[PDB]
Design a protein around this ligand. Sequence first.
Ligand SMILES: O=C(O)c1cc(C(=O)O)c(C(=O)O)cc1C(=O)O
Ligand SMILES: O=C(O)c1cc(C(=O)O)c(C(=O)O)cc1C(=O)O
Ligand SMILES: O=C(O)c1cc(C(=O)O)c(C(=O)O)cc1C(=O)O
Ligand SMILES: O=C(O)c1cc(C(=O)O)c(C(=O)O)cc1C(=O)O
Lengths: 455, 455, 455, 455
Amino acid sequence: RSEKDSMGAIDVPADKLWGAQTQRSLEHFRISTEKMPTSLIHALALTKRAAAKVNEDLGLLSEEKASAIRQAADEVLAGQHDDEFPLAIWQTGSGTQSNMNMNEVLANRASELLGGVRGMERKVHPNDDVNKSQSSNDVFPTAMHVAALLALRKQLIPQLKTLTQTLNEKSRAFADIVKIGRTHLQDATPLTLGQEISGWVAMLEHNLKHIEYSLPHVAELALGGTAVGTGLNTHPEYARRVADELAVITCAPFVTAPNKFEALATCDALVQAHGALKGLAASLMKIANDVRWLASGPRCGIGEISIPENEPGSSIMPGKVNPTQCEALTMLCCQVMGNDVAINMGGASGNFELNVFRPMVIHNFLQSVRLLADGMESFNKHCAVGIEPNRERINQLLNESLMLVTALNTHIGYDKAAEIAKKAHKEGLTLKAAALALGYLSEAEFDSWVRPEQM
Amino acid sequence: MNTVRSEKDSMGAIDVPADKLWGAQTQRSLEHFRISTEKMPTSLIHALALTKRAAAKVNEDLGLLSEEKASAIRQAADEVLAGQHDDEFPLAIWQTGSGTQSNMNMNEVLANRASELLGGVRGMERKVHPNDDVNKSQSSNDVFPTAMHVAALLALRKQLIPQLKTLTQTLNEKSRAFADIVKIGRTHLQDATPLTLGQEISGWVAMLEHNLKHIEYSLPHVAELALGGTAVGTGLNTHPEYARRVADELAVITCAPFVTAPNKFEALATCDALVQAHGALKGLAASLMKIANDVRWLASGPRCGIGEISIPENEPMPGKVNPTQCEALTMLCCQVMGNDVAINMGGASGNFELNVFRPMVIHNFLQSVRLLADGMESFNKHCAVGIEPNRERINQLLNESLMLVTALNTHIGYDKAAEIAKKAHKEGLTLKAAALALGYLSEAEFDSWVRPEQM
Amino acid sequence: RSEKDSMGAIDVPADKLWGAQTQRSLEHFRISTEKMPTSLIHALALTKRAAAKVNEDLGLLSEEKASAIRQAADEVLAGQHDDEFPLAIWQTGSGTQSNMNMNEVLANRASELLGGVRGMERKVHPNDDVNKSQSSNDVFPTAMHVAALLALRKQLIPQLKTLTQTLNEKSRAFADIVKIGRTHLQDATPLTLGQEISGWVAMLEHNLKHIEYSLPHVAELALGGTAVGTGLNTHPEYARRVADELAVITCAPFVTAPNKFEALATCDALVQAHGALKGLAASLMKIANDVRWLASGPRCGIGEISIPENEPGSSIMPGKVNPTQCEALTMLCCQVMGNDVAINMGGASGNFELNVFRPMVIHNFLQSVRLLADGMESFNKHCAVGIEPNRERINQLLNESLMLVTALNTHIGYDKAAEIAKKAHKEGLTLKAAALALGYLSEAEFDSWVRPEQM
Amino acid sequence: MNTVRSEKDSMGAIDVPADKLWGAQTQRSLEHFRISTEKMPTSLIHALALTKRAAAKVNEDLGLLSEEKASAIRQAADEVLAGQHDDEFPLAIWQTGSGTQSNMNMNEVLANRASELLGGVRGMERKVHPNDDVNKSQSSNDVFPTAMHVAALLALRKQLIPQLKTLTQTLNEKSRAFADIVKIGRTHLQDATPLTLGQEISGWVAMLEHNLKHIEYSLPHVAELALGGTAVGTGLNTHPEYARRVADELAVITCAPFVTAPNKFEALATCDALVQAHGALKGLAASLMKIANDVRWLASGPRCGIGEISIPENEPMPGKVNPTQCEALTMLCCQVMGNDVAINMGGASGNFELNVFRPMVIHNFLQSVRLLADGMESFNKHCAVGIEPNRERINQLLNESLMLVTALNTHIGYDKAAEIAKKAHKEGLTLKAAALALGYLSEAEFDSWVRPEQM
Ligand SMILES: O=C(O)c1cc(C(=O)O)c(C(=O)O)cc1C(=O)O
Ligand SMILES: O=C(O)c1cc(C(=O)O)c(C(=O)O)cc1C(=O)O
Ligand SMILES: O=C(O)c1cc(C(=O)O)c(C(=O)O)cc1C(=O)O
Ligand SMILES: O=C(O)c1cc(C(=O)O)c(C(=O)O)cc1C(=O)O
């Protein structure tokens, strides 16, 4: 088919709904393989849908066109036009290409929906109709916040709660299992496995509130700011109304940004929101490491806990259960850390009225959310729910450490108690064996004094 | 002073300069960790002293310390706080990851000094003891983390925040003052639709206001103190009311809302509160970077740049005024960005019951606070308060741009307006010149029609 | 179809060539959307091909099977089986899943090629045949280096040279155009546009040698190290031979790693090689920024150069040419910076005999190469080749700056010359206008003294 | 000293402490940039002095400076180098991005001191002048970059490299010593096939050897000096032989292969050489992090960890030996990682003819060199030289593992061997116990067949 724009005409694949501007970009921005993610495409479609409704309400668009555009939008949301967005993330910094991609796809489809044809003889026009009362400048940032807030609310937060609930049950289930504490990787005083796990729980609980604190700023929308933030060429009620419409159809508390200049010139809300995410990544990294070290073995590591074997193993090598879910989680955590740096440089690089590092910022942000959400779900289902204590190993280690000598101090002078600890350590004996051989006490009184369950 | 004093510890005797208040352990660390030049920050030292001062008071209250010994330790700490012993802490940041060595440094200095205060002498025949008295009811494991938060919270509340509010106020005043000044907008570095200088500056204001909220949201997690958790978090070897009492004392003497950490395992095993708080700081750094850049580009020139504004020339090519304050600010913003990565790595590396990357983490965190607070204070007083518009240059730019043709649309139609824009662009003429050459309107009409103030 | 392994049987989609282990992973590692990139799949196929050949040579594999496997491998290289590798990057840290994915696909296809069927009744066995004399431990790292070295040699380096050649021609073409230099964004002494561009050229030339210095370490292969690096269960000549085979079929100087322990336990070669890449990213970022700032305008920026308008523009807004290729390049540069951090954390996180952060490291590495290579190509073709000087603007600015007063010093006292500079600056006049009004000289002698083309 | 001295510059007169050698400009910077506590590194100060010393000699050689004045400046610099004026440089790192203020600091100190050396007095009636004499034939723009490379190259060659070679030698000796000690391998933290301790350590050796080469490859770019490029790189206002001559002088007095930069525009506009050199350093940091971690995990215990090796206990829970040197090393490795990001951001931010992020960049670079050099020196002398194997623990681990069953295959077949492994694993028995319980072999046969030394 032959589609055209100001620069003239250009042939586009007949079976496609996109136009000339999308085709040119497809030839000018052939960089790597990353394209806009589905969540962003949906957010962009939702933004066009709400814009169509409000424009209709203000009498700027005919009902016939308004409804057709919204219908084409719903088809995108339904997953009917995934193959219609071939543009790379590495395009113009404002995301203008992707805005045009949606305008053309929506206009062409909306034409067909009105008994028309796709292309040059279309009834609905991409710029004049679909992009009415908008600008690439304020539409893309809006799409970014819609996608981000929805991903955080719908995917990340629920998965975070679920994982916490599981670990919380585990904490309670193992509340009485006393184990040897470790600081600097060295044997220290005892604590219960339940207490150790409760530490992971509190970490996740704290992260949740931190992530929630970032939502309000992300809920602010640029729509209405127009080209530079002044709102020139828009109805005074447009910005507030469109924010309302979007809130209504997504069930999220979106609001119009109090300052459009800040909304257009920066990616601050995302730079901040992502800070909470890298915070979550550091916490998960620690939890994952504890799990895999505690399950290390089966014979030459710590082996205090056991996790489910998900992958098939060698017949001649029973016991080697690699903590794959832990390896997948730690890897994605490193990724979030890196994504943060990319976002920071982009967020700090805005100039004057517009920050033009947007596609890259949203690409990294959405990926982090995806990684963290799916990562917690997988870790939860394929590992966390199955954490079980190797009670024997736990006790063996507890009764093998010299750390329990403390209980004896209250019943025998610091030096005498420490005296048996020196012998046990030196001779390679256990505290009891050394205590009995040194004749400092009897088995009966020893056992009654060294009460690990009493801290 | 060449004269030494023989001090001793569990490992034996070692020589310490006679004129110094530290002991055996501090001397060993000093000789074992000769790494680089970074030592503990003055703020951290003072926080450690405040912690010991509070621990003493409460130990006295619980009758664990003799009133005389307690008051002595308390008085010695106050001298540290008054800046009388800044030279008594020579340990490098690069020491044991728990900060144990610096805890001992404070214990030894406080003991040797309290001894003298009790009519005693410093050294191995001191009246007050480092471990038995000064470190009573505490652990290196829970003391350092506590000092970290005390220092962090106070620096944020007393240094960072006040400076942020001040810069914000200044920019807000500038915003109101230049509200009527219309200038050319710039998107993608290209000329764009007009906006007032006041509106552009209001964007910086909103950025700073948003940053304040984010910083405020990170405070309650930092206010949580680990004191009471002892070695592994269980609180073994501590009076049940200690944690709460010591946290209350701290709150009282600092006037900061400190509270004991609900979960001590999370407090000892991680630096999560700081990883998250620093996330807000790197956010402020990204915003500051953008503001500083806008300021220097807008003041670039004097003849071959943008030159829309003028900034105070603070140092000794006639009109060549380098934006030095802007250069210091952008440089420190990059530092905060790198500091975030160092903090993230340390935060994600906790193992079991204790995170041993603490000195490095607090070192980077407190540096970022100093950099941001002082940077904003400097930028504000040496640049921000004196920003002035170059009204003539601004107006010259507006009248030379092709972006004002939009005002002609309603009078002569879009087609003729676009023709004028094209002519002016192709022939290197101003909009008025092109309009007149074509004869589409009179100069009087142009002057009455194109009013940039109605953008 | 029903495929099975040690854990039992599992149904796999009939029209697919993968087996049970791939199907289980597909259900256990449902994280995000990133899969192994084509270049890595090819490298893995090439590794299996070379392994099959050598195994045949050493008499470990029958000619019938050896040749069939190599044939199945060539089909993968031919792009016939892209849809056969559905595994996510976020899998087991050693890349075992992906190794099994290739073994199963290759075994199944190799069976069909031998008149057999795919599945349980296959003639060629994934583990026993395709993975003969190998381990997931030494195969994945080998695939990583093959993919990395080939991407650097075949894609990155050629694009780097091409871009340099173009800029080099430009430097030469503009060798005589004198322009105003800028330091701190302020007007400074003059230099030619050719000189400024030659700076970009030297930057690229230096980067090339830096990238070349990293190749030798990347050329070292782990194959032969087997499970822990000892080479247990392998023929002594295996490692060297397979390295040779791989060198032969790829035409790259691959060699067997001198130390297999270093090869297995770390990702050091990549951490180092990537360091050169982030170095290249910082250089490109600077070059891209200079281009877009120099082309800023058309009327209110610098506008010293003009670049090609690739995207269609508004009829009523001629002149607004957004530097899109520059925006795409700067965005991907920020990405490489972030990718480096992720790679660093992964490369630093190895434990004992094996680094298990591999899939994430190679994912980031290959993406950086792709971004940089395609980024330079696009920047070159759609921008660099079209850089043209706006000679008029350049001269206007040159004859408008006060910087030329220096030429007068040699003909008139420092103070007198500076005297006219003060007037020009203060009155807003040009150096000549001020010089003539101040009566310090005549137009003739002025023009003969102020020779900008003589530096 | 309360007494002041009146010094003056183009901006006027200002009071300087009478007891100090600096001047008016240094005093203004001191009062305008009160930011944080970081000042120029001693190494950088000395490099700046070396640069001025060389500039003087060559200026004398070209008859641009009077022999008397030249020798005086030269003698004053030597005092700085001898450490006699460390207190004369109070300027913060956070100053003008070109490092102009610190250049002036050295000019003023050198002038005031050279004056006295000529029988003159310091102050506004000095015999030697800061700008006219000490800064002769130079520019702040080309002097600071030069000082940066002098400092960088010397620190790498005299501090970093020697320490690296020393640690490598030590580890190599340990490798040869423990060559016969067979231990259990670990992949994914799980027990794996055996390897000798010497082989595991040889991996650390090869890592360090590879790092040395990478570091060496980055040196020639750092050896390139910008001196001669002047303000914008053209070399305007300089004797044609200056650049080469001054570079030769520097080379002679330092014995380092310094050479003038072939392209001065690349030298002034970027910090590329340092961005690249630091890339090799972050690589060494990742390797060191892995080695330090291996060491601390391998020494973990004494009863509930791995405990395969023992390290020197350097400071004053009997056998509880914290791996403090390991903790300092890992902490500083995270610092180098963050420093790389700060350096990258500054390196990527050059604008036109000059990069004004220099102080921050050199600050981070020299800190990384200090950290790595001192860290390796400390780790080597306080840990590495004393690493000893716990032969009994090692052997206990081997005999308790299921990984040795492989040796039975050739004698009793794979099926029976796997059965023994399964039995032992399910019932918590050693391989010998399971083998004997089944009656598949005699204890004598087990002892003769399973020889871990033949792994
Ligand atoms: O990226 C573009 O080319 C662009 C697109 C639009 C739009 O979609 O309408 C607008 C606008 O009219 O607001 C402005 C710009 C711009 O350059 O700033
Ligand atoms: O670094 C130390 O050596 C240390 C010191 C103390 C202390 O404060 O005395 C304690 C404690 O009893 O809480 C714990 C440790 C430890 O190693 O975990
Ligand atoms: O990841 C695995 O499950 C794995 C796979 C293989 C293999 O492909 O053969 C081997 C090997 O025999 O070398 C070892 C391991 C391991 O755990 O280290
Ligand atoms: O920072 C400065 O003020 C400065 C100082 C000098 C100098 O060394 O005197 C020069 C020079 O002539 O090379 C350039 C500059 C500049 O602003 O670009």
